[PDB]
Write an enzyme that holds these catalytic residues in place. Sequence first.
Site, PDB file in Angstrom:
ATOM      1  N   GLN A 292      22.904  55.138   8.083  1.00  0.00           N
ATOM      2  CA  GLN A 292      22.098  56.095   7.340  1.00  0.00           C
ATOM      3  C   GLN A 292      20.669  56.186   7.848  1.00  0.00           C
ATOM      4  OE1 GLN A 292      21.957  58.278   4.708  1.00  0.00           O
ATOM      5  NE2 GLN A 292      19.717  58.316   4.847  1.00  0.00           N
TER       6      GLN A 292
ATOM      7  N   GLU B 246      29.643  58.356   5.039  1.00  0.00           N
ATOM      8  CA  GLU B 246      29.330  59.292   3.973  1.00  0.00           C
ATOM      9  C   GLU B 246      29.020  60.652   4.584  1.00  0.00           C
ATOM     10  OE1 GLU B 246      26.351  57.174   1.908  1.00  0.00           O
ATOM     11  OE2 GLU B 246      25.049  56.895   3.650  1.00  0.00           O
TER      12      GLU B 246
ATOM     13  N   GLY C 105      25.889  49.209   5.139  1.00  0.00           N
ATOM     14  CA  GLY C 105      27.244  48.818   5.460  1.00  0.00           C
ATOM     15  C   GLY C 105      27.730  49.338   6.795  1.00  0.00           C
TER      16      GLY C 105
ATOM     17  N   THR D 246      15.668  46.944  -1.480  1.00  0.00           N
ATOM     18  CA  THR D 246      16.414  48.188  -1.412  1.00  0.00           C
ATOM     19  C   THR D 246      17.913  47.986  -1.580  1.00  0.00           C
ATOM     20  OG1 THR D 246      16.994  50.054   0.021  1.00  0.00           O
ATOM     21  CG2 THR D 246      16.407  47.976   1.085  1.00  0.00           C
TER      22      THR D 246
ATOM     23  N   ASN E  18      10.373  48.422   6.966  1.00  0.00           N
ATOM     24  CA  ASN E  18       9.729  49.471   6.190  1.00  0.00           C
ATOM     25  C   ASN E  18       8.620  48.955   5.288  1.00  0.00           C
ATOM     26  OD1 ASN E  18      11.591  51.204   7.340  1.00  0.00           O
ATOM     27  ND2 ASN E  18      12.994  51.079   5.597  1.00  0.00           N
TER      28      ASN E  18
ATOM     29  N   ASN F  29       9.502  57.869   9.609  1.00  0.00           N
ATOM     30  CA  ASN F  29      10.313  58.245  10.757  1.00  0.00           C
ATOM     31  C   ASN F  29       9.517  59.041  11.780  1.00  0.00           C
ATOM     32  OD1 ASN F  29      12.105  57.112   8.986  1.00  0.00           O
ATOM     33  ND2 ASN F  29      13.717  58.616   9.365  1.00  0.00           N
TER      34      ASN F  29
ATOM     35  N   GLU G  57      13.311  47.389  33.051  1.00  0.00           N
ATOM     36  CA  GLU G  57      12.177  46.472  33.062  1.00  0.00           C
ATOM     37  C   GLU G  57      12.250  45.516  31.880  1.00  0.00           C
ATOM     38  OE1 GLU G  57       9.808  46.736  35.508  1.00  0.00           O
ATOM     39  OE2 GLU G  57       8.842  44.894  34.809  1.00  0.00           O
TER      40      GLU G  57
HETATM   41  N1  LIG Z   1      12.966  53.910   8.770  1.00  0.00           N
HETATM   42  C1  LIG Z   1      13.909  54.417   7.791  1.00  0.00           C
HETATM   43  N2  LIG Z   1      14.773  53.471   7.038  1.00  0.00           N
HETATM   44  C2  LIG Z   1      15.743  53.980   6.034  1.00  0.00           C
HETATM   45  C3  LIG Z   1      15.843  55.336   5.800  1.00  0.00           C
HETATM   46  N3  LIG Z   1      16.772  55.528   4.866  1.00  0.00           N
HETATM   47  C4  LIG Z   1      17.263  54.311   4.507  1.00  0.00           C
HETATM   48  N4  LIG Z   1      16.614  53.362   5.239  1.00  0.00           N
HETATM   49  C5  LIG Z   1      16.916  51.941   5.083  1.00  0.00           C
HETATM   50  O1  LIG Z   1      18.489  51.680   5.343  1.00  0.00           O
HETATM   51  C6  LIG Z   1      18.933  50.898   4.393  1.00  0.00           C
HETATM   52  C7  LIG Z   1      19.917  51.694   3.468  1.00  0.00           C
HETATM   53  O2  LIG Z   1      21.207  51.261   3.689  1.00  0.00           O
HETATM   54  P1  LIG Z   1      22.288  52.365   4.252  1.00  0.00           P
HETATM   55  O3  LIG Z   1      22.039  52.591   5.722  1.00  0.00           O
HETATM   56  O4  LIG Z   1      22.121  53.671   3.481  1.00  0.00           O
HETATM   57  O5  LIG Z   1      23.848  51.824   4.050  1.00  0.00           O
HETATM   58  P2  LIG Z   1      25.071  52.316   5.049  1.00  0.00           P
HETATM   59  O6  LIG Z   1      25.315  51.304   6.138  1.00  0.00           O
HETATM   60  O7  LIG Z   1      24.677  53.648   5.667  1.00  0.00           O
HETATM   61  O8  LIG Z   1      26.448  52.523   4.156  1.00  0.00           O
HETATM   62  P3  LIG Z   1      26.827  53.986   3.480  1.00  0.00           P
HETATM   63  O9  LIG Z   1      25.698  54.412   2.565  1.00  0.00           O
HETATM   64  O10 LIG Z   1      28.115  53.874   2.689  1.00  0.00           O
HETATM   65  O11 LIG Z   1      26.997  54.998   4.591  1.00  0.00           O
HETATM   66  C8  LIG Z   1      17.711  50.474   3.592  1.00  0.00           C
HETATM   67  O12 LIG Z   1      17.237  49.287   4.061  1.00  0.00           O
HETATM   68  C9  LIG Z   1      16.682  51.592   3.867  1.00  0.00           C
HETATM   69  O13 LIG Z   1      15.301  51.046   3.748  1.00  0.00           O
HETATM   70  C10 LIG Z   1      14.951  56.326   6.580  1.00  0.00           C
HETATM   71  O14 LIG Z   1      15.038  57.493   6.370  1.00  0.00           O
HETATM   72  N5  LIG Z   1      14.003  55.838   7.555  1.00  0.00           N
HETATM   73 MG   LIG Z   2      24.125  53.882   3.714  1.00  0.00          MG
END
Ligand SMILES: Nc1nc2c(ncn2[C@@H]2O[C@H](COP(=O)(O)OP(=O)(O)OP(=O)(O)O)[C@@H](O)[C@H]2O)c(=O)[nH]1
Ligand SMILES: [Mg+2]
Lengths: 56, 420, 420, 429, 429
Positions: D11, D61, D134, D169, D196, D218, D244
């Site tokens: 995500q 998702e 995940g 989070t 973050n 981002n 490098e």
């Molecule tokens: N730099 C940055 N970090 C993000 C962002 N959105 C979520 N995160 C981080 O990613 C983590 C969220 O977990 P997810 O990646 O949504 O879980 P997943 O592995 O995708 O599993 P599913 O939701 O079922 O697809 C948290 O630690 C967030 O802080 C973003 O837009 N930018």
């Molecule tokens: Mg996710």
Amino acid sequence: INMMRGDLEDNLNQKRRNWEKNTKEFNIQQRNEKLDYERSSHLDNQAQNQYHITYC
Amino acid sequence: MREIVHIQGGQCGNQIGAKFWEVISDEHGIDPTGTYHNVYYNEATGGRYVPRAILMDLEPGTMDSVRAGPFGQLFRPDNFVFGQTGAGNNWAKGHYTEGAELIDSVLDVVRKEAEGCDCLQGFQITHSLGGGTGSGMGTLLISKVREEYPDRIMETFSVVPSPKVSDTVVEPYNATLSVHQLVENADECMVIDNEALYDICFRTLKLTTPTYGDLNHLVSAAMSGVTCCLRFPGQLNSDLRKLAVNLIPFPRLHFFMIGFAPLTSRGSQQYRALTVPELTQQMFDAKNMMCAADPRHGRYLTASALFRGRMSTKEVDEQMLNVQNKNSSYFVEWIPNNIKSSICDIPPKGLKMAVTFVGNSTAIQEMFKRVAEQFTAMFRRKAFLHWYTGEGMDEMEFTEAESNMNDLVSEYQQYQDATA
Amino acid sequence: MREIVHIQGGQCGNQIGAKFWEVISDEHGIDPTGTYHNVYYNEATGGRYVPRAILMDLEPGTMDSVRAGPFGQLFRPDNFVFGQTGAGNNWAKGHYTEGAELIDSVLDVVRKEAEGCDCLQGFQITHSLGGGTGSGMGTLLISKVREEYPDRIMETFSVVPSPKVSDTVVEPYNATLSVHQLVENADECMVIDNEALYDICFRTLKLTTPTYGDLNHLVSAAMSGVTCCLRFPGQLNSDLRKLAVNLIPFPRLHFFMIGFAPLTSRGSQQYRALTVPELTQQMFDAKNMMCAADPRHGRYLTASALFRGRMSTKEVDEQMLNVQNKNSSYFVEWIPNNIKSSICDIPPKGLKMAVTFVGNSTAIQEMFKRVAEQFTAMFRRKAFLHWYTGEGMDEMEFTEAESNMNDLVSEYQQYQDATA
Amino acid sequence: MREVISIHVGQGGIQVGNACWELFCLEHGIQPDGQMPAFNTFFSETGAGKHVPRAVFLDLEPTVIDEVRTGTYRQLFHPEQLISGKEDAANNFARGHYTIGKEIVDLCLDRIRKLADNCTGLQGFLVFNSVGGGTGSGLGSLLLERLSVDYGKKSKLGFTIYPSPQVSTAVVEPYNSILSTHSLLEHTDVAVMLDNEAIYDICRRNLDIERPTYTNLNRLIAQVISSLTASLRFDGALNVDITEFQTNLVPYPRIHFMLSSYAPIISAEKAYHEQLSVAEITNSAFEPANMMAKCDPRHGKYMACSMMYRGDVVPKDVNASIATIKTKRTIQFVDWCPTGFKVGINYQPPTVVPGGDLAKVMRAVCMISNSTAIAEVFSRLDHKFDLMYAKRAFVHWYVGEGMEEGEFSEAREDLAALEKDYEEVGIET
Amino acid sequence: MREVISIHVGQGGIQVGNACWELFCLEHGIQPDGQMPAFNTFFSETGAGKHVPRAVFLDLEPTVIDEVRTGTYRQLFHPEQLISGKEDAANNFARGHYTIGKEIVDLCLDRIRKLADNCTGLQGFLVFNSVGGGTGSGLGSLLLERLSVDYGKKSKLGFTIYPSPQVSTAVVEPYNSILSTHSLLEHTDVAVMLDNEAIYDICRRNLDIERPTYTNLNRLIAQVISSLTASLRFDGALNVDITEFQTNLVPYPRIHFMLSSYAPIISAEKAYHEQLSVAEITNSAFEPANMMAKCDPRHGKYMACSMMYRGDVVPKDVNASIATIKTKRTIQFVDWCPTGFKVGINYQPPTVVPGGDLAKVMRAVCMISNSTAIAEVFSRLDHKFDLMYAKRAFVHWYVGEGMEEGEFSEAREDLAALEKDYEEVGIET
Ligand SMILES: Nc1nc2c(ncn2[C@@H]2O[C@H](COP(=O)(O)OP(=O)(O)OP(=O)(O)O)[C@@H](O)[C@H]2O)c(=O)[nH]1
Ligand SMILES: [Mg+2]
Ligand SMILES: Nc1nc2c(ncn2[C@@H]2O[C@H](COP(=O)(O)OP(=O)(O)OP(=O)(O)O)[C@@H](O)[C@H]2O)c(=O)[nH]1
Ligand SMILES: Nc1nc2c(ncn2[C@@H]2O[C@H](COP(=O)(O)OP(=O)(O)O)[C@@H](O)[C@H]2O)c(=O)[nH]1
Ligand SMILES: Nc1nc2c(ncn2[C@@H]2O[C@H](COP(=O)(O)OP(=O)(O)O)[C@@H](O)[C@H]2O)c(=O)[nH]1
Ligand SMILES: [Mg+2]
């Protein structure tokens, strides 16, 4: 040749200062556009708050 | 007659070569088209002049760096040996696995450029000392061509690691690995640091925006002034071998220093005259050499001064005798009159005098000592060794390399103390 | 031939040197662009005349000023060796702390200046004694170069502190240190003091608004007249050494007094005649010299007089012999004809005759008594010492320094009493 | 004749990729339609007319891949590099490593192979995975292993959004983060820990935006990526090829976890009153306060430090500034690395994002630091793990998806064995 | 190339610093817009046009800092060099030196470091703080200790506003004045005691205004400061750097509490009437009516006098006047200092602040004096201390903030020793 080298380095330094003042122009424009942004967002916030509260 | 095939390699090699061919084309009155308006160029149909230089690397970006620049269309496209994979800044990569199974094409090009000459004299390479592709392919090509053409001679204008702060973190490793391939397979190797060039361009010319272009220009001017006493008339002409015999007393003490003169700022040029005592006063100055090793900390086993322009040879000889007898300490004694002179008859483009100073000094050993520390402090912990090991490199070689380096510095330490 | 390296130093040194080079450019007909319209100037491209001089100060202030004022283009920027931390009226701060950090480059440039000469005769300095920068840096430079050049002579046109109202409060400390240093490695401590200059400008020129410009111009005139009978044709020539030998009977007895003649206002100029009797009347009067020691309250171990102007000769000698054999009390007796003369052929710009009268007297013992007394009164309470010990120095030197000072006067008075 | 391949799993990966492709398209003059009104390193021409990017966008998702399928860039990416499944990862590692990805990895690998078939000077891979989640954790590690057993020699970087030190989070984070770290130990040559928490701090103080959002986060991450890739992309007096980093900053084969930093990230005003030369810019670049990751470098030693400069930069000031910054005593290196510096120069000044909070400036530096203080982070994170594994919390959601339980133990202990390296290398000879 | 840092901590310090920076921007000809149509000592050019001043403003109360952030000089200063706390100091020294002083002084040291790195030939420090205040003593002393342990050789010259022996603006001045005095005794090399009462009788006897206000006081102090720094700022016949002062006027490393004086101080009504000759101006400089510190210099004996002339100055009459002053029986120095006068000259007259009750005049003398009578101040001030510590008045407000109760004694004790030396010097030999 000495005179020519002096003149060329003078022109180069002038170009440097010119680009610096260009960047400062850009920075001031940036700050003022950010202030525009924040004031417009504040008015939008007041608008959404009225819209939500007068929602009987 | 007495031609030169200039080989380059790596980033520093390519950039210095670009600026060097620019300066040479300026000297012989050429324009970037390649028309006039044998030692360096070659004639081509329609009066064109193509440089006799092959350009090699493992990364095809540096080509578009040198080609697109001015005075670029000269080099014939049949020579850009550019592997399309990558270099990676690693010795074993560019000497055993990746930058090694390409060397056959480079040998092909060197042979097609050599067998087409009448009396080839020596190879003149420009390359870095710690850069992966540069140092690696340079030493491999050295081994090959020197095992191949012993009749000719070898000359390498290397750039040493910036002594104070480094530019890469694995520079000692590759520097030692290259040194162990140089003293066994070379015949003339000058060293240049990217550090003393800063001190010069900032305290000798009062520059404020010293671009790598200008430092490369200084180095290339020195390189041209070295051999300028060969392709031009002269009251006493030298070559690439009269140095190789009047300088090195023993087959390994062949690591020189380079100095150019005169170099002047704006006001400092307005206030000083062009008279050969002044050029001499500027030549021997420690702050005027392209090697970050203060010669005051040592002596000169020998030093050749190749002048240019037109001047009374008696003035040159009086200046040499005075600077030698007056600084009687900074010169070693068991080689009487250890300073050599030479006078060509062409000034630079826009001066009246010129001096190139090539000095086999016993003071640069200190620099090697410095490396002999860093490498040693990066080997008992086996730091970064597994990258080099990952290409089949046997650590044993490393050992002897350092050992070799030892003897080298030891050699110098045996002579600056020698008395007679 | 017989060149002279001018060493500036300290704020007073810089100002007086600016004025001195102004007066020399005036006399030799040099406009402030650098052209003409070897004893002092060096030739440079296009007939340019760059002054053989070196400036120095731990602060870039006065250097910036003299580079901004008139005749700021003459001195080459290679000779503006200047630190940026400042010294600040602390002799130790400018002789043990920052001395070792700038004296290296200062000796480098002074060597490049002296070797650039053919047959150097002597040095010549302009500095103060209380201000940290001037006293400290200048005396350290003198120490170094005199331990370097033993045969050539020194010359310190030193401004001592005024007796009544000081310029700095810690003045006596730096004064006694600089006078214990210069008494060992310098041949002429020609002392100058401001209050006598004020008395002159009020009494013999009528300028009631005496600005430092006029005082500096007066000492500039004296300094120029010192050596004028060398760089010009002469009925009876002299130099920096004929004085130095006709002057000091014993190397420690080398602290002179200065005097210039003639001095007139604008109103008096029309009437006052210019003949050698009235020139003598002026040069042998108390209120006419530039020292806080009444020449009528002492004697003359010797006194030389450099004349300038196409005048007679027999009358010069006759007036010298009269002035001697008349005031034989005010002169010393055991030496015969203690008055030495010399004559050049060219008067300065604006007059027709001129006298530089220098004298090895024994009246300055009053000045050194005053300085030693102030030293005792400020030392017997350890006052202002926690600076001169925080910079790597123990009180020992001071005492022994003052001790040496005593011996100095202990000789003067002695020779003022011997009779044979 | 030189290019990369960027993967954005999970995500957070797709988000930072959206921002990064925004920045790339708006730097090279490539319209959001894929048509022009240097790109061989990132984009590729479809014979004529429009550009297409070199990327693959995985998720499970359908939300974010759909949002970009009908957002502003609906007509930029080839519709075959947007791979979305049916179900969700649900923050448990085994869901995206044994059951769901079990066959989606086949399609992803076939697409990566078809991409690499077209690349001509491929250098390495730039993955993006928020291991706290995940799918970016599980599927990310599975894809890493698949590429490492498929291609091999090709370098493999990474830009992971680790769990923050303090702010929360998710609650099951120390499980699917430790598993990903154990599965990422060897296959990835460069891990650049992004968190973050520090960037929220920065946006609060330096960028003066009090109410930040992952959009600005981002934007800044994209700026870092572009300032790192400018070496390959555009010209520079001293360039570095990403291979490098694979050899300058990986002393020992296991330890490669580094932290990034950027300068100057300053608002319009706070830079308008500023000379901002190389000296100040690099003396601020080393500042522990504004590091992208979260740690206290003043409490640890440094091991290697790469610094890529971009913009009109004078080299003499670079040299002098690195000298004076190695002069400091608070910043010290380890015995076995005396030449602890790497530099690169690119003549391309930083590009500003139209509508971005970041201010335009000529000189900029991007720092990639392999330090040894970041070690403690793992410990702290490992700390959390124990407070959950002491009672086998949440383990059934993992053992239910075929994941052998003992795996946890191994990772939890084997990662702890990683400490055996760090606390050793911090000791002098 | 050579410059000074300017620190303004406390309330009175910041107001007088506002006045001083107004005067500095006016003299060189700098507009409050930052754009201008010698400043290396104070200002710094921002690459293109604007100028930032070398200054930091510490105060834990936002009110004055908010005022300067929304005053007429909102555009000049850097938006970070205006550091504001959130709570008052409340005139209890421990509040700004132990509890909250640990919070902001580290930020001050960060900013001071980042401001000094962009300088080359820095010489000293000019801190400005009332001692009677809470943060003007606590935070000031903490900052001074930090700078002493940090830099060292760099000179330090405060300009403190000591409470008058008669006029009172607080009831706990003795406590948090003794504390800051005992702290500053060994840190600041040259502390110029500037009183706040004698300036009132000055501006009532010379400027003839009956109801003066703090702003006039601050303008006059600004005039003194500019007349001091003009040597490094401008050119002149006798340049005297800042490292000159702490070299001439510090006989013993402990006794350095000097009192100042300024002339000419006259409004326009008699400006054309009076002649203001050099002799008469230096005579007015020495009359005990117009010494900023409330002391009768005749009580004691001077030890050092630094007189700085600026404008049209003729050295001959200067020396004559100084000689006459030396022969005056009303003033005399201690025996062991025969050379008592240090003199500097410049080439610039004063400048007038529109609204400044002073009048334009070609000549100006600022005379600072290390003397002995100033001792009595401490004595009388120390007096009050007894009549508070004899009943432990207000002590619990200090003991509740971490500061040890008995520490007062030490401080008090130490000042007694100070007084000891102020009698060990006035004795002959
Ligand atoms: N730099 C940055 N970090 C993000 C962002 N959105 C979520 N995160 C981080 O990613 C983590 C969220 O977990 P997810 O990646 O949504 O879980 P997943 O592995 O995708 O599993 P599913 O939701 O079922 O697809 C948290 O630690 C967030 O802080 C973003 O837009 N930018
Ligand atoms: Mg996710
Ligand atoms: N010369 C001068 N002194 C001032 C001025 N304003 C206030 N003062 C002095 O400040 C002292 C009062 O203590 P403060 O400085 O206000 O207390 P603080 O340590 O700054 O912290 P606060 O209690 O929050 O105000 C008094 O002695 C005033 O004489 C001014 O404008 N000029
Ligand atoms: N004076 C100068 N030095 C250069 C230049 N390019 C590279 N160098 C040196 O090149 C060294 C790095 O090794 P390098 O050969 O560039 O790596 P590689 O080419 O990828 O093998 C650095 O120490 C640089 O100092 C240049 O253009 N001018
Ligand atoms: N005759 C004359 N003496 C001067 C002049 N300027 C300074 N002096 C003396 O120079 C002394 C200061 O010495 P200096 O080291 O140059 O000052 P510093 O640089 O601040 O340490 C003082 O005692 C002054 O009296 C001048 O213009 N004319
Ligand atoms: Mg307050």
